[PDB]
Symmetry: C3
Subunit: 254 residues, 3 copies
Amino acid sequence: MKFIIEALKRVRERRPLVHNITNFVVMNTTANALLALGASPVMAHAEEELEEMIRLADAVVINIGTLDSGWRRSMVKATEIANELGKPIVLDPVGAGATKFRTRVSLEILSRGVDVLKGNFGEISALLGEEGGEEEAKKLTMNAAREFNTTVAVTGAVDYVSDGRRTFAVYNGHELLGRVTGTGCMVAALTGAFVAVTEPLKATTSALVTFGIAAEKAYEEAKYPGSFHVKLYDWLYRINENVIRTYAKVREVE
Amino acid sequence: MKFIIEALKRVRERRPLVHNITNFVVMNTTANALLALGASPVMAHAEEELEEMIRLADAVVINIGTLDSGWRRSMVKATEIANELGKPIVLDPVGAGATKFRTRVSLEILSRGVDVLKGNFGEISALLGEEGGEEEAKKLTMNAAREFNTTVAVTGAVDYVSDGRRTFAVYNGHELLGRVTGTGCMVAALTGAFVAVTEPLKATTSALVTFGIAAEKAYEEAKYPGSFHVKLYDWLYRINENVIRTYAKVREVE
Amino acid sequence: MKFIIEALKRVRERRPLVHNITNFVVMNTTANALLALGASPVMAHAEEELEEMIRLADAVVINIGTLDSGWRRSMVKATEIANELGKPIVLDPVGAGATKFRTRVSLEILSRGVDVLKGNFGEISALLGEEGGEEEAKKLTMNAAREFNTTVAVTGAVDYVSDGRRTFAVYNGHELLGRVTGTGCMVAALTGAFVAVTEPLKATTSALVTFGIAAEKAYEEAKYPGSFHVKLYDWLYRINENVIRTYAKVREVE
């Protein structure tokens, strides 16, 4: 899809700085994913520097994977600062639905407003439920997008992305991603780079297609978890116009 | 050994959720080790969600590698919650004997009760000493198991595992593991998966044999630290009945 | 250069313990870099064990990449403890100049005294400016070294290291390092190992040459970010006298 190739080019030409207030398991992993793609990561959470860092950044990615009271304070404050400045925010509600704490904090951030909400079926369904696979996943994506007035992506074998009016289905990816931790978190981080250079719906769709293709390419070279993980970074770096043209599996729905 | 092949099969069929309250150096590393083996990891420490997360989990792994007062509180509380629910607990006393703080916290957790205590000679000897290589390592393993009323593993060139009555010696492994950080921590995390599906003595022995074989297989493919580390995950995923049958080096002692 | 080959040999013969109070993104990464080189890492920050850990260590590496009020307290206390004991300190002012918080904390640590200050042009220039490319980088390195009464390294395409009286230029390295996060942090950690066995100027210069060569060797084997990252550890382990003799690009300036 044309806007995907152009978005990737924009990310690499502009080299956006993506501020991550993320979890301990994906600190290095999402930073390297961003660098491989062509963006620049910065991980910071101290309330003493949140304003200056978010001012410096082009986008903010919030990941609650390993949150606690201290990080929650930083994440909520960051959301308020980013919204005041108009810096796009990407939220990955890791574990929402698993514990009330995660569901509560996710809704708290969503109440203030984010630009992209990205999670799996269970996480997004839990958020929409508390607040109030294909056809059902598509409906969930749309309802959540309207409910939270933002662009939502419900990831899965087939990913669905919607801003409430338009919807895209992404078929790229590989099941071995299930054996590498924080892959959805990598997508959230990459989305941060794309949203810095293009609107939310196209940015998130572009992130899913790009990462999904990288996963397919990585598997071609490595059939096992360890080597496969390494190849993900290789392909986030190597993916280009020709690869997207030949591997992209995405369509607009409805 | 037959119970090892069966334990591995059980881990992969049941896909247990292993809750880790661990150290910053091994967050990603132990999560990916668990995923490669066939289990599911979850890293969480917030006191606001410990009960719900431990309720969700099938086993709890505590690693004090980078502890502080805040994490200590979470670890002790987790131990009390897990014991009330009957969820097996694996403790890796990283650095016990190196600082009083680590020795103290380890004994505090052991006093409440764990199902598996796993560490090297120095760590376990320090715990047994404060509380109160082969032949000496074997005796240490046994005395510690009776002292702390649990299954203990003293890792080394040859690993010893004992529940106080029975003891096993594991000869699998490779010295290059000494050049990859947190490998013992990987074993503790994997033990969490095994203990969710089989009793402590067999679970820990199975974890040591499985990881030890993965280390041997990884070295066959990679002779240097970086590439060797990557291959560990590949083999935790590839190891199967035939590999265990042909590579396992384990025997019951006494 | 002869003192580099000898320093590397000393690191591997003595296997120094390098205490790191570092950032979340480089926890595993710097630990494995140290192990590959031949040193032993230990990551600890709890005020309850700082004294015992620094007493145990041969050098202390402080990295403010993901600091907060809690870690700042630990870092400042560690600096005071290390100086009282005479344990060499390496400071990597990650992000100094980006936020006042990072600049402030860096200067606070520098005021108490460190043995090696290592950062890029922007970070060191911000510290020297607040306190008060080649020719300019060289002048910066020298002025900063005299200003902070320590050995300073301003990293870049060409690295400059000076203790205020003597200066060295390092030409080794590869641009792909820009696509792997925390590479400068890896150098700071390695410097911790070298400074434990040789004086600051030679230790830092040796660290830059060794890592720079590892980068060149890694690129020869891997042209993409993921695989390249893995090969860095392989070569920190494989580099030896012959490789240094044939690849080293370093000279004393002035």
